[PDB]
Design a protein around this ligand. Structure first.
Ligand SMILES: Cc1noc(C)c1-c1ccc2c(c1)[C@H](OCCO)N(C)C(=O)N2
Length: 127
């Protein structure tokens, strides 16, 4: 029923870094997806109470959303690009797992992912 606490977006005991790749992830990748017309359902954790989806957090045990990702990048939560790329993949994967292959939300995720894969194809090599 109730929503779980959201994923953490800072942690005093987790080592922080900024790499040119993480800068690219925030400035080009996140920026491009965030502003997209299909971004809004992904800009914050799935609110399963408000959506009336009691099974969401019985099914999805590794939630992720772009709001969480944006804050992680802003806080320099990550050590490397892979951690961030992983968060995006988890977000898309959760969507494809919970929802049916027809669904608008799935089609939305697919277009965002297609864009994601384009931008990530041009990730710079490290400075
Ligand atoms: C993301 C995600 N992954 O699995 C689910 C379910 C979502 C999701 C999150 C928020 C919303 C919706 C779906 C839903 O559909 C949005 C597209 O119609 N809706 C009507 C809405 O108001 N917000």
């Amino acid at each position: 029923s109730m929503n779980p606490p959201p994923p953490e977006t800072s942690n005093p005991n987790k080592p922080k870094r900024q790499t040119n790749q993480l800068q690219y992830l925030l400035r080009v990748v996140l920026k491009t997806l965030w502003k997209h017309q299909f971004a809004w359902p992904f800009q914050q954790p799935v609110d399963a109470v408000k959506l009336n989806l009691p099974d969401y957090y019985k099914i999805i045990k590794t939630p992720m959303d772009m709001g969480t990702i944006k804050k992680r990048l802003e806080n320099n939560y990550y050590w490397n690009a892979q951690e961030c790329i992983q968060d995006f993949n988890t977000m898309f994967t959760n969507c494809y797992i919970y929802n049916k292959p027809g669904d608008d939300i799935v089609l939305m995720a697919e277009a965002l992912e297609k864009l994601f894969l384009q931008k990530i194809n041009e990730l710079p090599t490290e400075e």
